[PDB]
Amino acid sequence: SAVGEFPGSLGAKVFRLNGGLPGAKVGKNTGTSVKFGESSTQALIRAAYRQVFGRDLYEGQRLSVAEIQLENGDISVREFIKRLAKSELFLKLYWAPHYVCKAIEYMHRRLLGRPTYGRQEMNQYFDIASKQGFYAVVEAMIDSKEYSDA
């Protein structure tokens, strides 16, 4: 029952949309150039990038549409992570060049911060990869209940 616990000072830092996204409400009736909470959401998006892709991306590589939708509040952080993972950049960098099981293992470590416990998880994601594809494997890992709880 402690999956949602956060590792205070013992684990890696955690990023959340705790603060309201800028422009979420019409309370800031236009203008307001110094609307303070936007660096937090920019840091959140860049941290999600650093999570899914262990490093920062280059200029042409960022997903501007997904970024702006997440900033606007059309989608949640889960859907932003989903789109980053399903992005063809992830496909080219981490999925295609690798042995299939190695790719799924790295994907699981990357999208849950957790190496797979073993052959049960590997079999589930492996059947997913054989039947549907990269997109459905990423979808399954994102929509697994363990991801929701953590």
Binding site: N18, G19, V34, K35, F36, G37, E38
Partner: protein, 160 residues
Amino acid sequence: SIVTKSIVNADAEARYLSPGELDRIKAFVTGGAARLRIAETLTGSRETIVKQAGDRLFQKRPDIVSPGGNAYGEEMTATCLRDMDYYLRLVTYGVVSGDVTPIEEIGLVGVREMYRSLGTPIEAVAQSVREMKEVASGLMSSDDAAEASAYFDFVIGKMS
């Protein structure tokens, strides 16, 4: 705003303001007179500092004002100095607030995209801001120059 940054951090950790953060806010509010004196000096001396910094920048990077450059032409030089004035005003905002957040908000986020679209050299802009910092340091006291150097170097690093 240093107080706003402290509030943001406290809310992010879901806690009341720390005693140390409250002490920092207290010290900032106490020193606000000296801090705002720097902004007063910059606002008063905006024209000479901007013009001198622009001349020094053109001396250091004559190519930008040369034909085929972004700043070539009287109007282009005028608008370049106008952006100089914008960044000086943003530095004054930052020194007043005690935080670089207003600078990053108004004149720093998306600056790469804006100057790429305009064709402007962001390196040249950073050099111009460096010249502005040097001129302001010359026109101010050593302590005040050092204090404003934090904001100026923040803008420089974010530029490049």
